[PDB]
Design an enzyme around this catalytic site. Sequence first.
Site, PDB file in Angstrom:
ATOM      1  N   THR A 165       0.894  -1.153  -0.020  1.00 45.04           N
ATOM      2  CA  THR A 165      -0.159   0.164  -0.076  1.00 45.04           C
ATOM      3  C   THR A 165       0.996   1.392  -0.119  1.00 45.04           C
ATOM      4  O   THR A 165       1.718   1.483   0.821  1.00 45.04           O
ATOM      5  CB  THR A 165      -0.824   0.238   1.246  1.00 45.04           C
ATOM      6  OG1 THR A 165      -1.956  -0.826   1.262  1.00 45.04           O
ATOM      7  CG2 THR A 165      -1.219   1.509   1.743  1.00 45.04           C
TER       8      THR A 165
HETATM    9  C1  LIG Z   1      -2.281  -1.139   2.423  1.00 38.38           C
HETATM   10  O1  LIG Z   1      -2.022  -0.666   3.496  1.00 38.38           O
HETATM   11  C2  LIG Z   1      -3.412  -2.155   2.746  1.00 38.38           C
HETATM   12  C3  LIG Z   1      -4.689  -1.816   1.874  1.00 38.38           C
HETATM   13  C4  LIG Z   1      -5.476  -0.546   2.793  1.00 38.38           C
HETATM   14  C5  LIG Z   1      -5.548  -2.992   1.752  1.00 38.38           C
HETATM   15  C6  LIG Z   1      -2.896  -3.462   1.953  1.00 38.38           C
HETATM   16  O2  LIG Z   1      -2.475  -3.523   0.788  1.00 38.38           O
HETATM   17  C7  LIG Z   1      -1.701  -4.027   2.788  1.00 38.38           C
HETATM   18  O3  LIG Z   1      -1.854  -5.215   3.464  1.00 38.38           O
HETATM   19  N1  LIG Z   1      -0.679  -3.283   2.997  1.00 38.38           N
HETATM   20  C8  LIG Z   1       0.607  -3.509   4.054  1.00 38.38           C
HETATM   21  C9  LIG Z   1       1.110  -2.333   4.468  1.00 38.38           C
HETATM   22  O4  LIG Z   1       1.268  -1.488   4.010  1.00 38.38           O
HETATM   23  N2  LIG Z   1       0.909  -2.434   5.892  1.00 38.38           N
HETATM   24  C10 LIG Z   1       1.599  -1.230   6.703  1.00 38.38           C
HETATM   25  C11 LIG Z   1       2.993  -1.094   6.327  1.00 38.38           C
HETATM   26  O5  LIG Z   1       3.691  -2.105   5.792  1.00 38.38           O
HETATM   27  O6  LIG Z   1       3.635   0.046   6.859  1.00 38.38           O
HETATM   28  C12 LIG Z   1       1.388  -1.576   8.049  1.00 38.38           C
HETATM   29  C13 LIG Z   1       2.652  -1.751   8.917  1.00 38.38           C
HETATM   30  C14 LIG Z   1       0.447  -0.178   8.567  1.00 38.38           C
HETATM   31  C15 LIG Z   1       1.519   0.802   8.408  1.00 38.38           C
HETATM   32  C16 LIG Z   1       1.509  -4.003   2.959  1.00 38.38           C
HETATM   33  C17 LIG Z   1       0.946  -5.259   2.293  1.00 38.38           C
HETATM   34  C18 LIG Z   1       2.918  -4.503   3.792  1.00 38.38           C
END
Ligand SMILES: *C(=O)[C@@H](C(C)C)[C@@H](O)C(=O)N[C@H](C(=O)N[C@H](C(=O)O)[C@@H](C)CC)C(C)C
Lengths: 243, 250, 204, 244, 241, 231, 226, 125, 196
Positions: free
Chosen positions: I1
Site C-alpha cells: 500500500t
Molecule cells: C495497505 O496498507 C493495505 C490496503 C489498505 C488494503 C494492504 O495493501 C496491505 O496489507 N498493505 C500492507 C501495509 O502497507 N502495511 C503497513 C506497512 O507495511 O506499513 C502496516 C505496517 C501499517 C503501516 C503491505 C502489504 C505490507
Amino acid sequence: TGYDLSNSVFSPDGRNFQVEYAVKAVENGTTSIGIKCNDGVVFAVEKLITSKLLVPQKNVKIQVVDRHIGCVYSGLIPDGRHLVNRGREEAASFKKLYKTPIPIPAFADRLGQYVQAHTLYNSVRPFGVSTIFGGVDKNGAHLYMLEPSGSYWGYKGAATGKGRQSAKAELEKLVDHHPEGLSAREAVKQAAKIIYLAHEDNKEKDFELEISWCSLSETNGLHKFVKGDLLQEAIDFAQKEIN
Amino acid sequence: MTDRYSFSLTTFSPSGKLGQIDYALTAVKQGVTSLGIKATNGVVIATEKKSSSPLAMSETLSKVSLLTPDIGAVYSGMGPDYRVLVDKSRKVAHTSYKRIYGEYPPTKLLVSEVAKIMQEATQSGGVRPFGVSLLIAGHDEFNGFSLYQVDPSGSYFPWKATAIGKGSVAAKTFLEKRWNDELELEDAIHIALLTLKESVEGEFNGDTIELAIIGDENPDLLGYTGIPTDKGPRFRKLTSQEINDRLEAL
Amino acid sequence: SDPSSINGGIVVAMTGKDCVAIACDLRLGSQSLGVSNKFEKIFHYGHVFLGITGLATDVTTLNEMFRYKTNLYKLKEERAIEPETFTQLVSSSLYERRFGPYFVGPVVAGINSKSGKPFIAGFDLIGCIDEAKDFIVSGTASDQLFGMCESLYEPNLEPEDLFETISQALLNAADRDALSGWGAVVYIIKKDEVVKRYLKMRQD
Amino acid sequence: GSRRYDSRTTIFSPEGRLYQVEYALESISHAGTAIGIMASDGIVLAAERKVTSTLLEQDTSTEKLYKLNDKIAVAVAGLTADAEILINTARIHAQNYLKTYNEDIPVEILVRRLSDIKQGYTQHGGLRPFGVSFIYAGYDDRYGYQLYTSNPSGNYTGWKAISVGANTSAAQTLLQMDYKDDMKVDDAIELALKTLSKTTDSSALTYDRLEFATIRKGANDGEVYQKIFKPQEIKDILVKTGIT
Amino acid sequence: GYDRHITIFSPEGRLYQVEYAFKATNQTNINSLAVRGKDCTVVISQKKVPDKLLDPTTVSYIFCISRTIGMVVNGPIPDARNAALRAKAEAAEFRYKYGYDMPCDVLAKRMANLSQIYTQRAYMRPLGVILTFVSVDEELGPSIYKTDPAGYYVGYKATATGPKQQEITTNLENHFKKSKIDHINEESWEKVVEFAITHMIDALGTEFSKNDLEVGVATKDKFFTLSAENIEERLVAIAEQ
Amino acid sequence: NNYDGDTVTFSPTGRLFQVEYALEAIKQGSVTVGLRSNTHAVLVALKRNADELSSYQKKIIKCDEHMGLSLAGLAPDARVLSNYLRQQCNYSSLVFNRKLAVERAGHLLCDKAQKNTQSYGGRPYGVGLLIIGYDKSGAHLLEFQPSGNVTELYGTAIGARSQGAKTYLERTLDTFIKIDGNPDELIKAGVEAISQSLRDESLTVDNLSIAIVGKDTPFTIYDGEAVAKYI
Amino acid sequence: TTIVGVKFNNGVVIAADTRSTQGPIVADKNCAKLHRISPKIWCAGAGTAADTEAVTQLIGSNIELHSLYTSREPRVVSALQMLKQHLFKYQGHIGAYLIVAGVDPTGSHLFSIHAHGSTDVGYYLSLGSGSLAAMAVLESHWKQDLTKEEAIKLASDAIQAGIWNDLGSGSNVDVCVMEIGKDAEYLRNYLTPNVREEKQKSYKFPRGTTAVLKESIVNICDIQEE
Amino acid sequence: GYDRALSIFSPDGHIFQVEYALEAVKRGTCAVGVKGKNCVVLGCERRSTLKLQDTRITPSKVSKIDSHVVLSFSGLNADSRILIEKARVEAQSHRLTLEDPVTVEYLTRYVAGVQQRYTQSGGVR
Amino acid sequence: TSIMAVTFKDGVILGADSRTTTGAYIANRVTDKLTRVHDKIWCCRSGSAADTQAIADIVQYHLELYTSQYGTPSTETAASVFKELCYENKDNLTAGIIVAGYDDKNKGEVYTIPLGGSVHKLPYAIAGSGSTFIYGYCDKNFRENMSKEETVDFIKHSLSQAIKWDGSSGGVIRMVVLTAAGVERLIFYPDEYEQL
Ligand SMILES: *C(=O)[C@@H](C(C)C)[C@@H](O)C(=O)N[C@H](C(=O)N[C@H](C(=O)O)[C@@H](C)CC)C(C)C
Ligand SMILES: *C(=O)[C@@H](C(C)C)[C@@H](O)C(=O)N[C@H](C(=O)N[C@H](C(=O)O)[C@@H](C)CC)C(C)C
Ligand SMILES: [Cl-]
Ligand SMILES: [Mg+2]
Ligand SMILES: [Mg+2]
Ligand SMILES: [Mg+2]
Ligand SMILES: [Mg+2]
C-alpha cells in the site's frame, strides 16, 4: 393537591412546583452578575460579611472551569460547587476526545442537560442555584445564565439573587447607552458599580466585592481574578457613583 | 436516579379486584371499534381509521399490522401501547421461535408470547398494564385458521367471531345472527363491512376503513421465485379500491 | 487426544420407497480397550429418529437435551415434532456452542406424518445441515461407509430390500474400522410401523 | 421519593394475616369451580368454564385443564395468564428432574417446588402474589394416584376429593356426603358432574361450559394414560350419567 | 389520589400526568406551522425576545438534527434540548448501524416510542414537548411527522402547533379544500416560505418584522434555518403584492 | 410540615427542612472554640460526660501531622467525615508527596456533605466541625456546616451557648491575631473565649480538651493534667 | 468452494458450486452455498458452512425486523454494515467470506465481505479455493454494459472453471438473478455437468442374506386408551 | 432490587411486623414437646375442619432435619418449608466440613439466626 | 500500500494506489484507500483493511454527531478522534492512517498516525510498504506553497516510483483534492504513470 410534594410531577397547570420552589432558594441568595464586553466577559458577586471574624479575600465564590470559562452562582453554594465539578468533568472529557478546549455554547448545553435531568425523577432534588457563566472561544465572547429548570439563553448582561431587579435595570441602561459595545476595563468598573447599587437590597450587613474576567486583549482569552490596584480602582469608581 | 419503583403498582383490593387491570379495560372500552370473523377458508380483521385531523395523512397510521407472513393484529384502546406491543411481538416471533425452529410460530404460541408480555406489566415493579385489547388472526399448517383476543390482564380466548371497544356489545349481537360454520371468506368480508357500518358515524369508504385478511398464499407478494416450498404470505391488507368495490355490492 | 475418535462408533441412514432406514454399531471403547457391546447410538422422539456418533459423554448429554426440548415442544405445540423442524432444532442447539462445541456427528431420520415424505439429514459438530436425497454417514468409519453406500445404494428400494443394503453397508464398513463393531442395530421406518433388528457380526 | 406509592405487598396485618394472600383468595372464589376426585383405579379432573358465548371456539379452547408431563395434570382456578407463567415453570422442573435422575418427577416434589415459588412472592420482592389455586392430579410408583391443591400463600395439602374456585363450601359438603374409599373411576366421573350440576350458578350444565380429564391405569397393561375429553366426548358422558 | 401524580390508570382509564404534560406544551406561548412544496418542506415558528439583556441569536426552538432532518419544538427549552440531543444521538447511531441516513418518519416513530415508555414506566416523567420533524425523504419526498407526550405520531400534508393551533389548522384546511392537492404547487422554496408566512399572518391576524419570525427549510440532502436578513427579503416580497 | 419527610423535597419558600433539622443537632452539642494567629492555630473544646461514673466524650480528632478538627453534634458522623479527611490527606502525601492545603480540605468536605442533601434515601450529616491546620500559606481555621457551607475564619465557636465565645473573639480580634511565636498566650485567649459560654459548670482537669498546630509544632492534643496549667 | 458475483445492465447475478469437503472426502455432492438474507438481497458464502448460514440467518432476521419497523424494503448497504460489524467484533473466529448482492430503491449493488470484517466494491468478484480459476475467466471475458443473458453465461462459466480445475469445487452450478423492478429468480442446479454414469452391476442382495439375532416392534405411538 | 424497610421500630420501641408474625403463630395448630429421662416426644394437633384429606401424601407436621434431629412448628405452613430446607442443607454442610453431625443446640442456633436475619433485612418480612 | 497527503497553496491533496493483496494474490486491483470522514476531512488507510475500515466508520459516526451538536469540526479534532481509537486499542489494531483536511481559517493540514497511536502534524506525509522507496525522492522534490498542477505532478511521480518497486502496491493512482472550491476526484491509469 399534593402535586408540589414530589419532583417531576406535572400539576394540572403543567408546572413542576419543586423546580419553582428551587427558584425561591436562588432568590434568597446574594447578588451575582455577568457583563459581555467587546472581546470577553466580566463576572462579579456580592459576599455578605456575617462577622469581623471572616478572613478578607479568602472565601472565594467565583470558580474557573478548564482555563477559559468563569462560573458564578446565587443560592445554595454547595449545589453550585456540585454543578461546577460536573462542568469540569464535561470540559475534561470534551478536550480528551476532540483536543480543542470546549466551546462556550457546547459547555452551556452540558450544564443544561445535567440540570434538566434533575427534574425528570422523584429520587432527586432540583438544583438550588441560577448560574451565570461564559468565556472566550474560537467564535469570540459568550455569556450564559442557567436556571434550576435547565433553561439557559445567551445574554448581553445577566443578574440573579436578592438584588436582581436593581442589577437588571442598570444592565439595561448600559445596553441602550452603548450599542457599539463596552471595553473590558470599562465592564470591570461598571460591574463594581452594579454590585454596589444592588447592595441596597442587602443593606443590613456590609459586604466584600469580588470580580473576575476573560478578555482576548486583557487576559489572552484566559479566566483571571481582578486583584490589587485594578480591584481598588473599580471599588473607588463604585464608591464615587453611590455618593 | 435509578428506577426506585421495584414494587408492584397493580395490587389486589379487599374485594379481590386488580384495580389497574379494570381501569385498563375501561380505556379499551373508550377506544374505537375493531372486529374479527373466521371463515372456512380464511379470517378477516377490520377497524375504523378515526383521523385526529383532516390535515393528517391516515395512510401513515397503520391500525392493522403484519406480525408474521401468516399472522395479523388489530386493536382497540391506546395506539402508542399497541405500536410498542407490535414491535415486541415481531421481535419475540424471531428470538423465541424462528431462530430456534427455522419456521414462524403458530398463531396460538405467538398469542401466548404477547399475553406473557402483557401479564408482566400486570405484576413487575414500577409499571402500569397495557391499555389495549388485541385481536390476532393467523394460519398455520397443523391448526389451520384461528382468531384470538388478548386483554390487558394477559388472558386470551379463541373466537369464531367477536368485536372489542366502543360498540362491541351491539357488534357481537350482530355477528351471532350472521355467523355459521359454512361461510366462505368473501361472505365474512361482506359481514365485517355490514357490522362495522353500525359503529361508524361519519364517512364510510376505503380511505376511512382499514381491513386485512388471512387467506390463500400470495406468491405475487413473496418477492422471489425458485423455491417450490415457499408460496408466499397468507396475510394481505385490502387496498382503498378493493374495499370500495365490495361497498357497491353491500 | 482427538475427542471424535476416543470412544469410536458409526451411524448410517438411507431413504427408500415410502420408508427410511437408520443403523449403528454397539461399540464403546477407551481408545484400544473395548468397554461396552450394548452402547446404542440411535434414539427417538416420537416418530423422529436421531443417531449420534463421537465423544460418548456428549452423545448421552445431547440425547438427554433433545428429549428435554422435544418434550416441552409437544406440551406447547400439542403435537409431535416433525423431522424437518427437529433438523433445525439440532442445528440451532449445536451452533449456540460455536466456540465450545459438542464433539458429535448427529444424523436425523424419519417420515413427515402429514406429507408422508421420507427425510434424512446429517450435521457437523457446530450444526451445518446436509439434507441428502440418497444417504448420510457419520463416525470413525465414515470414509468406509461413503465407499459402501456410493456403490451399494440405488433409489426407491422396498423396505425389506433397503434393510439388506444398509445392513451390508454398515457391517462391511465396521469390519474395516478398529474402533467400530461389537454388534449392530438397524431400524426400518414406515409411516405407521417401525421394525428394529439386531445383526450377528464378528466380535473383534 | 418512590416510597410514597408502595402498597407493601409482603406485610402482616395486626392479626398476623398476609393482606394480599387473603385478597387473592377472595379473587379465586369468583373463578369457575374445579373439582378433583381420587379413586382406587384412577383420578378425575372436572372444571366449569365461566359464562361462555355461542361464538367462542370450544374445541381449540383450554382455560382450566393443563398437562404438566405424561403422568401429572392440573385444574386452574383464578387468573389464567398468572397460571400459564407457573405452568411453564412446572413443565421445566419436570424435564430438569428427568434429565438429572433419568426418572419421571414424583408428584409431591413438583407440587412442593411450585408452592415454594408462590411462598417467595409473599415473603420478599414487593410484588403482588399469583392469583391462582391449582388441583394437581398425578401418578408415580411410590404413592400411586395422588390429589393435591396449592393456593397463593404457597401452602399445599393432599386430598381424596377437593374443590377450588366458586362455591367450594357447598361442593365440599356434597363430596364429603357421597365419597367412599372403595370407589371406582366411572363412579367418580358421575360424582364430579353431579357436584358441578348442583353448585353451578348457570341455569343448566351443558358440554360447551365444561372441561373434563381422567388419569387411568386404563392403559394397555402396566402404564398410565391422560385423557383430555373432546367436546363430543363430554356431551356423551353427560347423556350416559343422565344430566342432559 | 396518587393516580394523578404518576403514570397509572385513573378509574376513567386516563393518564392525568400525560394530559398535564400536553398543557406544559403551550407554556412558551409560541405558534409553529409546517407545509410541503413540490421539492421542499418549510417550517415557521414565532420568535419572542421579551428581555433586552438576552442575546437574540441564542433564542431558538428550531434544531438541525441531521443534515436531512430538521425539528421544531412546542414546549419549554430544557425538555426541547433533552429531546434534540437524543434525536441527534439516535440519527447518528442509525447511520452507523444500517449504512443510510435515518428517515424523518422512522426518527419520529423512535422518539414517539421513547415517549410511550415514559407513559408506562412510573419513575420516568413525560417530556412537556410536541416535536415536529421535517425533511425531503429520499423515498417518500417532502415529509412532516409530529410526536406528542402520549407517544402518538402521524404524517401530515401540513400542520400547526401552539395556543392558536386551531385557527392556523382551519386556515390551512380551507386552502387544501380549494386546491384539491396534498402540497403547495410551487417550484422555489422561497415562494413556499412566502406562502407559510402569508397564511400565518391571515390566521393569527398579526404583522411580522424580521426578528418576530424563525424559519427552517428542508431540501433534497440538506435542512437549514434562514437568517434575519433572509427573512427580511421574504417579508419585502409579501408586501410588494 | 409536609415538606420535611426527606432531604429531596424543597419547601414552598425554598427551604430544606431535613438539613435545618441536622443543623439543630449541632446546637444541642457541647461548645467548642477555634482561633489562630499568623504562626499557630488553636482548638479548645468543652467535653460532656453522661454522669459522674462516665468518661468525658472526646471532641478533637487528628487528621494529619499538620491538620485536625473538633466536633459538635453526632460523634459517629464526625468519625465518618474525619476518616474521609484522613484518606484525602493521605492520598495527597502518597501520590503527590504534598501536604493537603486546608482550603482544599474544606472544598472536599463541602462536596461530600452536598451529595447527601440532593439524593433520595440518604440523610444529611448531623455534625459541625472546626478544622485547624498549618500549610504552605501559614495558619488556617475553617467552620464546616452539614448543609455543605465551609467558611475560613480568624476565629469562631459552635455548639450550645457558642454565641458568648463568638462575641468575645469579635472584640479580641486585633489582640489574638498578633500573638505570634507564643503558643501558651494563644491558648490562654482560647480558654478565656470558651469561658464566656459556661453556665453553672467550670473548666476542670478532665473537662477541658485543647489542641494546637503551628510553624514548628505538629498537631497535638492536650487532655488531663496536661491542661491543668491553663485552668 | 467457488463463488462469483457479476454486475449487469439492470441488476446483479450470483453463482456458486455445490461441493462440501471434509479434508479430501466429499461430505455433500449438492451443497447450497447461496443464502437469501432478504427477498431481493442474496449472498454467496465461502469458508465455514455453519458460519455462512448462521451469519446470513442472524442478519437476515434482523433485516426483516428492521424492514417492518421502518416500513421500507431492505437495502444491501444495511446487510453489508450489519455483517461487517458482526464479523469484526469476532476478530475472524466466525469463518464467513461472503459475496453480498441485491436490488433496492437505491439500485443494484455488489460487495464482498471477508471474515475479519473488510468490505470490497466491484463489478465482478469471486471468493474461495476456486476464486483464481474463476477470476481468470472473469478477467478474460468481462466488459461494461453486459446484458442479463451475457452475465448468467459469464457467471456460470467462471464457476465451471472452478468445478473442473479446483479440487475444492465440483458437482453443479447454482445461480440467483436479481434484476431491478423484478422478482429475484433463484435457479437451483442451473447446470448439471457431473451426472454419474450407470454402474456395471446391480448390488441388490437376495433377501435373508444378513444374519439376525433378535426382531422386535418399536412403540413410536403414545400411551394408549383402555 | 426491592430494598424497603418493612421491619422497623415504633415510638414505644416495638417492631410490629415481628409482633404480627407471633399472631400468625397463635393462629397455627398446637404443637407440644416433652423430654423424658431417655427420650423426647413431639405431639401435634391436626384440625378436623379438613376431611376427605389424603393422610398418606399430605405434608406431615414433624420433619426430620437429620437422622437424629426433628423439627415441628406452629404458624404459616409455606414459611416452615423454607426453614426446614435451609436446616437440612446446613445439617449436610456441617457433616461435610466438621466430619460430625450437628448438635441439637447448633441446628437451633442456625434456624434462629435465619429467623433473626429476616427481622433486619430490606425488602423481606 | 502506497499513500501520501501533500499540503499546497490552495489546500491539500490525498494520493493512494488501488491494490489489496492476500500473500502474492491481488484480491482487489481497484481498491479505494481514500475515505471520507467529513465533507472536507478525508483519510489515507494503510495496514489491516478490516481495522482501518472499522476505525474510519467509527470516526465518521463521531464527527457526524459532533457536527449535529457543535458545527464543523477542525482537521486537528478529526486527527484526535483517530488517535484516541488507535492509541487506546494499540494491542488489537494494525492501522497507519494519514488524516488530511481543508478549513478556511487553517487552510490545508496533514496529520500522520503511525502504528503506536502517536500524532505528527506535517507539511506532507507518506505511509504504507511502498513509502520506503520514495523517502529520498519526496524529501528532495517537496516545496511548500506549490500550485495544484505542481502538487498533482509531485504525487503522481512519487506514487509511480512506489508502485514500480513495491509488489504490495499497484493498479490505478487515485487522488482527492480538498480546496475552498470543493472536492475533486482524480484517477491516473497505468499507461499514463508508467511512462513517466
Ligand atoms: C495497505 O496498507 C493495505 C490496503 C489498505 C488494503 C494492504 O495493501 C496491505 O496489507 N498493505 C500492507 C501495509 O502497507 N502495511 C503497513 C506497512 O507495511 O506499513 C502496516 C505496517 C501499517 C503501516 C503491505 C502489504 C505490507
Ligand atoms: C467453501 O467455501 C466451503 C463450502 C461453504 C462448504 C467448502 O467448499 C470449503 O471449505 N472450501 C475450501 C475453500 O474454498 N476454502 C476457502 C479458502 O481457504 O480459500 C475459504 C476457507 C476462504 C478462506 C477449499 C476446500 C479449500
Ligand atoms: Cl423503538
Ligand atoms: Mg471392527
Ligand atoms: Mg479387536
Ligand atoms: Mg411516567
Ligand atoms: Mg507493483
